[PDB]
Assembly symmetry: C4
Homo-oligomer: 386 residues x 4
């Protein structure tokens, strides 16, 4: 109801200067105060109780580092290559449907500008349901070396997909991410709630359709949305290039595991089934700090993705916001490796980690209301009255 | 003919004379065995209690429980005016109207309810204090009632991708019939507290009127008679199940089984987990400023259930089993099923959550080959479609809900019970696709991550001095705000 | 400061009628509002951070029951015998120094009246630093069969102790509890704090002094204050009768284990070293409900003790308070056995218990301030405005 | 002679000219290597900065760090009035006086402080915002800083009874000397933020004036010179230890070791866990509206420590080891000790708590026989006497505290540092009796319950809808109140 004015006093001239944004949560606190209710509902939502959405972040907290001291770390190099090309930093913007709800004027173009306008050029997955055409987004994209991938929601009308694959290969996208964790649109009750005052995606998809989609294209194929060791090993038996261990930001099945627990489980199997070199394994979901990024790289992930932080940077400070988020994260990784005693993404191995309490995901017995309610704790000292 | 004078006189505990609907009853022998505590009858002895009485009981109870020669006689004209008891609402102020504006249509239109918690919220705001305490309470500290639900959250899923999940089919077979859904309505006592006009006649209706029909379990302590509730059923194809408390006068029980069998209920669920009434302190508290009885016999034994099979042709399900050895025993006397339950945490506190006993029991049932010969149901704390799926993956034939159907029926009558069925039917169908399975038959434990099932912790007390002085990081302030 | 008047409007005629006290916590909420600050400080205190004081209660919550259904439980008998005599119920009032701070007019006499004035007669441990003489307390004691024990703080001046042992044996006390967990008076900073506006106990005590104290008396001897399996087995090698597994209500060493964890550990060793029949093992600390009592009895304890609940019942409703607390607890035990499917304290064995998470005493990693601070949960439905 | 005009001119990042105490300095080469960030120097370039400068630095720093020919010359008379910088208190309003009434004597009399948390509380109320942020902050999310202390609580005790604990003796030997206590004061940088007049000269004093004297570790970044701090020591028998950051200009480091060795410090603690400055976001935040440098060389290697042994006769302790393999390496190059530390959680977040690495390390040190040849110290989050005892039982020779001595010295100067020593000396003595041991030598791991050491959990998110609607039990209301 006419909040738009209050909200406008918020973003107009009260957002702080980008030089004061310390971490990816600041982009998120500011976007929750100014985005429109339906932008906010749609970007932040999770499926149902959002325990997977949050467990995704929190599972990073079950893993602690075992650093090395007295290692020369004057120079640290954080570039890696993902899926053939060499990339500046080991993370990427992952794909967000409808980026124009938050940044109406420039949509997923400003993200494209942000991933290539600064020193660091980060990859950008363009969403099949992006609110700006592939055409435009790739054209906004400031800088040759900055790479871009299409993620695909195969349609029931396979005609539309085949044309679309062909048209983006024409446009030079550098790989195909087929999202398979969404045969139906998980329930996101925050949306639902405010929406009170699908043909588009084919629920029939199958590994055979991935096999045929292989033959219809030359780009590399990454299945986005694996959540089991068994389908990582399958995506390897039908020969795709990649697999993103992901549960769609916890917007699809609640009580799906966090990707980092599934990565730590799958990688030893890959190594024992000898498949490890044959598969790029990416991981996204709830990654908010450089040490999160680094924990996933140490276990074997090739690149970790981020959806919501970029998206809220982009919605509050447009393409410049996305540049600042790209470097905030770039400095976190870089400072932490220096502190970890490694100098290059390939040095990042598992023995930099204490994985002994990775499975200490607990649900504690219900608090004792009454005992807690009569108990009074000690008190600090006081200060003279006056 | 009995004079008011003579009547009123006997207002004392070892001589309870009371009047209900212009009739005097000698309730002396009766009150220590009144299911809803003897306090009510004791206190209101020597009065005309009909307003307490008439709106909370099944129409058949005076005839069914009191010896014929205790129905004393007609009261002459009427009581003294301050001897007719007004409707029982302990602790309720004149609130009755503020909670009636609260419910009168400020209750949101029934197509805006997104989940089963919405009905809890709505009922906690509009229901009568006696009925909220009665419906929402657990035994003592309620740690088993909360634990019943949180134990679900110690289980994660292990989904399949790129499976054609175009058509998914959630229907199944429970106890001989084929049901549309894998959940049912468990027996709750006294539904008229929250739905004074229809009570159970409305859950008979929401369960059967729609394109999905859910099994209904009727309670031995239901505020409507089993005839009234079956007669309310709108569909000829919906299943009703009768739940039994066996009385110390076993002929009373024996007539009751014969009766519900003729009305055509389809199974007999014999509750065995309340030999004594658990202590529900929110209720208790509500009378102080507002445990045995012969009614539930505290002597049932495995031999009784052995004798009941012989008296009946309905399948018998033992409802209230809390450990594997009793699951295995129930199997050995050839009963058809067992409902793993702790009665919604209203009886022993620190009884375990049924999802955890089921994860324990079903592998022992498989290894003993008794697995295919006993259907195992589970209830307690099931609020979402993925709780139901966690139980079906571990082996339970069917999942019971007692409390969400009581708040739904309480705020919205039968269309609440039908809406509540759609919420949950959609949530299950919806996560069967995202799990990559298309039929209940495909739910297997290899779809669950069971490795932290047992990670039920009690953490050490924390340090109020360390945390009293710690300040966390802060977010950026706006230039304004 | 003149709170005494407000406080007096509290206890005078605003305490609820004893018939409305539902559980042992109600006695505690009411005593915290009316006791004098120094009574309250001294009764509720723990050593230092009070984590042992609370862990004592909470460790009961790590243990869940495995009940039996379809057991005739029309009749349940909860009496047991402790230390030779046969006792009504399996719990006892444990010893509280200075009971007159809360009940100034009748001190530990009203407790003595309370343990024998009703149907149930419960034991009463009389404290060496009780604020009423043994003489009086035993004389207040209404009823022959009601039993009473002295607990002893041996003095440095052993003369005073020897006379005192002899004088209480004269007075018919039924056993000696020597408290050994207190060679110094643990720091109870709530006291300390309000006290801003020892020869009495011998820190030299040793198992030899217990050996000699055996020869100077005929009463049975219980060492109160064992906290290790090793000294349970020692108290058995020098032949005393009992041992109370206790850490003095967590007023002595913080980070002492809860008695119930130590009981569950010690009892199998006793059984394997064959000593089990030779030792009564009691257990007190943080027992507040009948199911607590029952969990300790199932593992082998002979009787569980309670300090603070009796003490606050006694300070708010004097001897009648203590009667009501004795029956509140008596009905809890009795209802729960009925629900457990057992009919007699000897039926209470370990297999009535799920001890699988007894050691799930966890300290979780620090909450993530910022993530939690930007996250907003789902919302219940609302109700029309008006 | 230099004219104000010429000076002020160069107020730009690649030409920093600044005036401090009537003297112009060319600080251009210098500011990217200024330990307290280059931002301060950058911003105040072209001004007379003496009020920022004079009150926060050791008296010897311009002479020790700047090339002699950069000390430009005398400034002629004085700056423009709005070019003399006022004392740095970022984000502090005129608050300086409300916090000065706060501290002026409404600070409670020093014999009422019951524990080390009291000083935290008092300093958080009276200290300057720059100094509270600086002293109290951790890296990033601060989970290692809090975790440093809570890890203690995952260890319980296993006490002895009926042991004669009449006389208990807490004294011990650390690094060759015999100390009265098993704790010491770890090096904190900039003590003048919280104690502007004496800084470190007062912890030299509280540590030595009393009947108990505690070892003091002096920082390479101390706001007083190592001479001033040793000269302040009141007792001839107290131990001072020097902590080193080695600089990229190794001659600067080499002169510094030679110097502190002549002043008679007793050990060299070489911090190795901050090659780069951890990101302490409370500080950061305080300048926005208020990481390498050559100063700490990011190239030290095990060979450097190998070369330092040859240059020195002090024992060398490596301070900042976070894993067993580096404990074992430090042992293999024959250094005397290792301080298991993560620098008070100010450097890498998700580094482990030192009490847990020590429980891991000491059994591997015993089995390799290196156990007796390396003294292992531990710091981080030690606030009570039973934390110290948990570390001594597991093997640590001595426990370090950096932050409680900084709040104590900040609110109460040297008598705070002496009081803080008594609080902790009493708490240790006191629990050695209740453990039943009378000497540090008797503390062994068979006195600890170590079975839940590793029970460091992160629980699943909980269900805000289930808990939003649950109401717990309530206590009895008074008839009144
Ligand atoms: C005439 C014989 C009676 C029979 C056979 C009878 C039977 C029952 C039964 C089967 C219940 C269900 C218990 C539950 O689950 O809560 C009940 C509850 C109750 N009855 Fe009766 N009743 C009788 C007389 C009375 C009388 C005379 C009163 C009037 C004071 C009364 C008041 C109640 C109340 C208040 C409850 C609900 C328990 C509560 O307070 O939550 N009943 N009765
Ligand atoms: C003349 C050469 C200088 C030397 C050798 C020097 C040295 C140092 C050292 C060793 C520290 C300790 C760092 C810490 O742990 O926080 C420090 C801090 C600091 N210095 Fe200097 N400094 C110099 C010039 C300046 C100047 C000209 C300013 C004036 C703006 C200044 C302001 C500060 C401040 C503000 C800090 C504290 C860091 C904070 O803000 O928390 N320094 N300096
Ligand atoms: C957030 C989001 C949105 C807004 C949208 C979207 C998304 C999300 N997604 C997801 C992804 O990309 C990822 O995975 C992320 O997010 C991760 O996590 P974080 O935590 O970081 O956030 C998606 N996906 C796909 O594939 N596609 C698209 O488009 C998307 N979107 S939806 O579908 O959901 O709408
Ligand atoms: C809640 C409830 C009520 C109200 C009542 C009742 C009950 C309950 N129950 C129980 C059952 O049904 C179940 O189990 C349920 O509840 C579970 O939980 P949830 O959580 O889901 O809810 C019962 N039972 C029988 O059988 N009967 C009857 O009636 C009942 N009720 S009482 O007895 O308690 O009254
Ligand atoms: C509480 C208390 C008080 C007040 C006092 C006292 C006590 C206590 N104690 C202790 C005992 O008795 C026990 O152990 C109890 O308490 C248990 O716990 P609960 O939780 O229940 O509370 C004691 N002890 C002895 O022995 N003695 C005496 O006297 C005592 N007291 S003091 O010493 O501590 O004062
Ligand atoms: C807190 C602190 C400050 C203020 C400063 C500083 C520090 C700290 N550090 C560290 C040490 O000393 C230790 O480790 C402690 O702190 C532990 O924790 P607590 O929790 O106990 O407190 C340091 N270190 C060295 O070495 N140096 C120096 O100077 C220092 N400081 S900084 O660097 O960071 O500035």
């Amino acid at each position: 109801t006419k909040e738009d004015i209050a909200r406008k006093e918020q973003l107009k001239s009260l957002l702080p200067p980008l030089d004061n944004i310390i971490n990816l949560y600041d982009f998120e606190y500011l976007a929750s105060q100014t985005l429109t209710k339906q932008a906010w509902a749609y970007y932040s939502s999770g499926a149902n109780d959002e325990v997977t959405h949050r467990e995704n972040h929190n599972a990073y907290h079950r893993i602690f580092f075992k650093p090395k001291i007295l290692v020369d770390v004057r120079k640290v190099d954080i570039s890696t290559d993902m899926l053939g090309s060499h990339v500046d930093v080991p993370f990427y913007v992952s794909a967000t449907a409808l980026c124009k709800l938050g940044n109406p004027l420039e949509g997923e173009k400003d993200v494209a500008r942000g991933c290539g306008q600064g020193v660091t050029k980060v990859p950008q997955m363009i969403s099949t349901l992006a609110s700006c055409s592939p055409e435009e987004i790739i054209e906004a994209a400031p800088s040759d070396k900055q790479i871009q991938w299409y993620q695909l929601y195969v349609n029931s009308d396979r005609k539309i997909t085949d044309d679309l694959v062909k048209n983006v290969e024409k446009l030079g996208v550098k790989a195909l991410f087929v999202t398979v964790d969404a045969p139906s649109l998980g329930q996101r009750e925050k949306d639902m709630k405010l929406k009170f005052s699908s043909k588009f995606i084919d629920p029939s998809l199958t590994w055979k359709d991935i096999e045929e989609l292989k033959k219809k294209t030359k780009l590399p194929i990454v299945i986005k949305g694996v959540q089991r060791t068994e389908d990582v090993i399958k995506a390897a038996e039908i020969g795709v290039s990649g697999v993103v261990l992901s549960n769609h930001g916890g917007r699809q099945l609640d009580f799906s595991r966090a990707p980092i627990e599934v990565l730590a489980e799958t990688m030893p199997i890959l190594e024992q089934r000898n498949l490890k070199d044959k598969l790029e394994v990416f991981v996204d979901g709830g990654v908010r700090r450089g040490t999160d990024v680094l924990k996933a790289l140490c276990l074997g992930a090739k690149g970790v993705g981020l959806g919501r932080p970029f998206l809220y940077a982009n919605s509050c400070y447009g393409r410049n916001g996305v540049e600042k988020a790209i470097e905030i994260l770039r400095d976190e990784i870089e400072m932490s490796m220096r502190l970890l005693g490694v100098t290059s993404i390939a040095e990042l191995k598992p023995d930099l980690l204490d994985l002994s309490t990775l499975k200490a995901r607990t649900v504690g017995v219900p608090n004792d209301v009454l005992y807690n309610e009569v108990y009074e704790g000690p008190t600090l000292t006081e200060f003279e009255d006056a």
